[PDB]
Subunit: 114 residues, 3 copies
Amino acid sequence: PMFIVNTNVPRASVPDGFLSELTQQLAQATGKPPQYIAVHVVPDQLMAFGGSSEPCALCHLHSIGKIGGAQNRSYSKLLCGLLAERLRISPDRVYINYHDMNAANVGWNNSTFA
Amino acid sequence: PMFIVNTNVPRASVPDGFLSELTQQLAQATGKPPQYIAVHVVPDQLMAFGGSSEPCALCHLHSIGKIGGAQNRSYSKLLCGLLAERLRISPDRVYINYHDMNAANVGWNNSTFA
Amino acid sequence: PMFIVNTNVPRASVPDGFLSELTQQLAQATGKPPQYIAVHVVPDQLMAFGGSSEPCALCHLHSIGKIGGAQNRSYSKLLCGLLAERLRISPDRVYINYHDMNAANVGWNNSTFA
Ligand SMILES: [Zn+2]
Ligand SMILES: [Zn+2]
Ligand SMILES: [Zn+2]
C-alpha cells in the first residue's frame, strides 16, 4: 500500500511520529506486512475544499487488493480519525481516492509484483 | 470533483483568487455544487515537458462520474484556457489525466460516497 | 507519457541533467517521441517506506498504451536503475504505479488525445 496525504495544514502542525502511526495503522487495517506500507505527507499546500481554505486534506491510497466497499469505509473511518485527531482536519473536509492496483502494474525492486 | 495542477510556474505568479476561480468554473463544468469541489495548485516544481522547462502543467481531475469523451474535451478547453490566461502556460504544455471514480472508491467524512 | 518521482532525497542530491536523462530514457523505453514525455521530480519529501525514512521513492507513470506485464518489468528495471545510480535509492525502496490511460481521458492542447 501507498498512502499520500496533501494538506494545507502547516508542517509544524504535523506531530512527531505521524508517519510511523500511519504506517502501523495502515498495516493493521489492510492486513499487509508493515514492510510493504509506504506513506507520504505533504503539508503547507495551496488548496481549497468547497471553495474554503480552512484545513482540508486530499489523499490517495493505492493497494494491490484489499480495496472494496466495506474495506474502504473502514479505511476512511480510520484515516479521517487520524487526520482529525493529529492534524485537526474535519472529516467532512477530507477526500480519499482508493485505487486497486493490478500486481503487474506495480513496480518494485527492479521488477513488478506479477 | 478534485483537481490538482502541478506546475513549474513560481508561486508569486499564481494570481490572487485563482483557487476560487478554479472552484467556480469546475462546479459549472461538472454540474456539481461548489461545496463538493476541491482544488490544489502546486507551484515551483522541478518539471520538464517535451525536454524543456518553459512553463508547463501536469494535472489530474478525479470525479465520481461526469467523465467521458465529450465532457473531457470541454474540461480541457476550460482548464487550458484558465492556465493560459492566469498562469501564462501554453496549452500544448499541459497534460490533464481524467479519472472516473466509483462512489465506493472515494472516502469522505469517515465513510465513502457509496 | 508522464512520470513523477516523489522522494525524501534532498534537492541538492538530484544531479543537474536528471530531468533530461529521464526524458531521454523514457522516450527510448516507451518508444514515444521526447516531445511527448513529461517528467516531474519532487525532492525533500516527508515519507517513509516500510516504516523507515531511509532514502525511498514513490512514483507514477501514466501513458496512453505502452503499459503491460513485460513492458512494466522493463520500465521497472530501467527506472530503479536510474534512481539507484543517480539518487542512491535502493531498488527495494521504490514503488512505481503504472497507469494505462485511454486517449479520451488525457487532456492536452484544449482537447483530448482521442
Ligand atoms: Zn487517483
Ligand atoms: Zn492518474
Ligand atoms: Zn495512481
